[PDB]
Amino acid sequence: DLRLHLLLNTSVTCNDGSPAGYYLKESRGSRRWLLFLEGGWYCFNRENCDSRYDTMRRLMSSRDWPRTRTGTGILSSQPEENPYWWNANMVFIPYCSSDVWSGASSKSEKNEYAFMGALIIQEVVRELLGRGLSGAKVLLLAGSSAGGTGVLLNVDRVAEQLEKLGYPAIQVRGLADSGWFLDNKQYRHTDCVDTITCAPTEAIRRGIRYWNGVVPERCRRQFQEGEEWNCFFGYKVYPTLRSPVFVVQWLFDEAQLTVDNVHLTGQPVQEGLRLYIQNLGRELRHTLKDVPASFAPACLSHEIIIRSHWTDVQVKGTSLPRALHCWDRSLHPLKGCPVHLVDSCPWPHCNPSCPTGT
């Protein structure tokens, strides 16, 4: 079990002004620290944030959080379930800022909600340094879905923070799961008039302004004022990052298909949709060709790393916990211990180890 700590700096808050926090299980014999960012969509105006507050409140408030959580998948402390990092210090950071971990704005006379995701990560790191993170050798910032995009936006800021605080020996690394999206041509098209019709590029442009969203400086300098939305797309931000980053991405991610206005239904896939899906997998493989640490199976699914059966999927006969172990060795190519694992078959579930869904 991981135990809840609400932040001591209570000016760093969830959307409704309640304090943010983290869940910690610590491993006193270990100098490895895993900090995991939860996902779960986002909101980008008053009306869609108000609706999220009524039916997704744990993603906007700490008032009802439980005192403990059980670690699963990569957050499990049992080697049977987590062959990779079972003995590490474990931290789960709940997503309660609705801003893809980018925001830097407080609730105030002019702001009904606070969007503090970038500040929440900084404050968790600060408070952990007094609880043993000061002695760390490796800090792995991991996350799934909106949390995986959050890793790409924040990993170099955590590295800079630790340098400026006087901890240059801590090696900061990132693990981005299900957060690598394409700003591609959609299968059907609507102009952005409400939540359901707004494509991701348009919704993120509006969100950055509503949240006071921040992006990595080297990416911001390329795209410049007004164009910061580009830095939310993995293939554009990744080449600007200096910390080592391992990318996990299903080739046919269900969230990518949803934002492309594709809905698998009743089994009748005609030629136009067949070509659309095959081209999506080819484009996503193309973006990963020069990413040396990656795991990209040909499946229709969503998230991997905190699922209890995360070890089952294999690419070319190698599981994700094995590839992450090989990545660790690479940062000390390796015979029989690969780190770049991208499927080449062209259709969902052409890999027999894909999740069934049951």
Distance of CA 114 to CAs 110, 306, 350, Å?
A: 10, 27, 44
Cβ proximity to ligand NAG: between 6 and 345 the closer is 6
Which residue type sits at 351? N
Residue appearing with tokens 């049977």: 80
What is the Cα–Cα distance from 109 to 290, expressed in whole angstroms?
47
Cβ proximity to ligand NAG: between 11 and 190 the closer is 11
What is the Cα–Cα distance from 37 to 181, expressed in whole angstroms?
17
What is the Cα–Cα distance from 254 to 111, expressed in whole angstroms?
33
Count of alpha carbons within 13 angstroms of residue 332, beta-carbon side: 7
339's contact among ligand NAG, ligand AWP, none, with CB below 5 to 8 A by partner kind, is none
- State the minimum distance, in angstroms, from the CB of residue 283 to ligand AWP: 15
Q: Which of 37, 100, 237, 251 binds ligand AWP (CB under 6 A)?
A: 100
Contact residues toward ligand NAG (CB under 6 A) are 9, 11-12, 119
9's contact among ligand AWP, ligand NAG, none, with CB below 5 to 8 A by partner kind, is ligand NAG
258's contact among ligand NAG, ligand AWP, none, with CB below 5 to 8 A by partner kind, is ligand AWP
Secondary structure letter of residue 185 according to DSSP: P
What is the Cα–Cα distance from 305 to 75, expressed in whole angstroms?
8
Q: Just list the catalytic residues.
A: 145, 253, 302
Cβ proximity to ligand AWP: between 41 and 167 the closer is 41
Secondary structure letter of residue 186 according to DSSP: P
Spell out, one character per residue from 233 to 272, where the chain touches ligand AWP: x when CB under 6 A holds, - when not: x---------------------x--xx-------------
326's contact among ligand AWP, ligand NAG, none, with CB below 5 to 8 A by partner kind, is none
**Which element (helix H / strand E) includes 2?**
strand 2-6
- State the minimum distance, in angstroms, from the CB of residue 162 to ligand NAG: 16
Cβ proximity to ligand NAG: between 9 and 61 the closer is 9
Name every residue whose Cβ is closer than 8 Å to that of residue 141 and which is 6 or more positions away in sequence.
Answer: 35, 37, 121, 151, 154, 155, 158, 172, 173, 174, 175
Beta bridge mates, 341: 295
- State the minimum distance, in angstroms, from the CB of residue 335 to ligand AWP: 37
259's contact among ligand AWP, ligand NAG, none, with CB below 5 to 8 A by partner kind, is ligand AWP
- State the minimum distance, in angstroms, from the CB of residue 311 to ligand AWP: 25
Q: Report if residue 181 touches ligand AWP, rule: CB under 6 A.
A: yes
Tokens of 130: 């007094």
Q: Report if residue 200 touches ligand AWP, rule: CB under 6 A.
A: yes
Q: Report if residue 204 touches ligand AWP, rule: CB under 6 A.
A: yes
Residue 68 burial (10 A CB sphere; 0-12, 13-18, 19+)? exposed
Beta strands in 164-251 (DSSP E): 171-177, 245-248
68's contact among ligand AWP, ligand NAG, none, with CB below 5 to 8 A by partner kind, is none
- State the minimum distance, in angstroms, from the CB of residue 7 to ligand NAG: 8
Q: Which residues bind ligand AWP (CB under 6 A)?
A: 41, 100, 149, 181, 200, 204, 232-233, 255, 258-259
